Design a protein around this ligand. Structure first.
Ligand SMILES: [Zn+2]
Length: 56
């Protein structure tokens, strides 16, 4: 259930999931006060859906 705060260096707030090919969008959570990418993990400098990584 870990989430990653949407990178401000990308400025598009999205990345293309290479494993199942969905465009990953993120939402601003007003309670935590940050943009969220949930079920997401960074592997070797790239962000992937954490759910998808297990298939590889
Ligand atoms: Zn995915």
């Amino acid at each position: 259930g870990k989430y990653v705060v949407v990178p401000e260096t990308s400025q598009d707030m999205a990345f293309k999931c290479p494993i199942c090919k969905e465009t990953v969008t993120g939402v601003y959570d007003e309670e935590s006060g940050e943009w969220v990418w949930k079920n997401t993990i960074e592997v070797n400098g790239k962000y992937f859906h954490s759910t998808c990584y297990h298939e590889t």
